[PDB]
Design a protein around this ligand. Structure first.
Ligand code: NA
Lengths: 25, 127
């Protein structure tokens, strides 16, 4: 596949600039 | 079914918020996703590039599996990243054939799992 790993990768990124960026350090 | 689930469906078929309160879930969910969408446009651009094949072909089952799998360990901000993705994917597949939120029920089930946390993020932590 690798298509579904990608999306997953990309979603974690966004939710890391969120629930990590403007949260605690 | 739950207040959160009802709101996800509503949002997924953009019902259009009337009567917004700081603690109206649909409105606040809606605001959180528009904010995520704008602030991570470029990222949704990449995400589309990755999924164009699945969307152009109308490959629902893959899209569903892709997102459910993505949702697995998920924290509230990925769950909301995912719902934002799904909203735009729903809209794009409509160009091809009638797609509505029920087709993705199991994804919704995964975006709404651990309610208190997701709501907690929407109200307290989203922007
Ligand atoms: Na529906």
């Amino acid at each position: 596949s690798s298509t579904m790993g990608q999306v997953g990768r990309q979603l974690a990124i966004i939710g890391d600039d969120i629930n990590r960026r403007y949260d605690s350090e | 079914m739950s207040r959160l689930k009802t709101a996800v469906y509503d949002y997924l078929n953009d019902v259009d918020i009337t009567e917004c309160t700081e603690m109206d879930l649909l409105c606040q969910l809606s605001n959180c996703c528009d904010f995520i969408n704008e602030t991570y446009a470029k990222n949704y651009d990449t995400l589309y590039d990755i999924m164009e094949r699945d969307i152009l072909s109308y490959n629902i089952v893959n899209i569903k599996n892709t997102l459910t799998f993505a949702l697995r360990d998920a924290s509230p901000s990925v769950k909301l990243a995912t719902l934002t993705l799904l909203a735009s994917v729903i809209k794009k597949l409509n160009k091809i054939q009638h797609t509505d939120a029920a087709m993705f029920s199991e994804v919704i089930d995964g975006i709404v799992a651990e309610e208190q946390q997701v709501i907690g993020f929407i109200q307290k932590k989203c922007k």
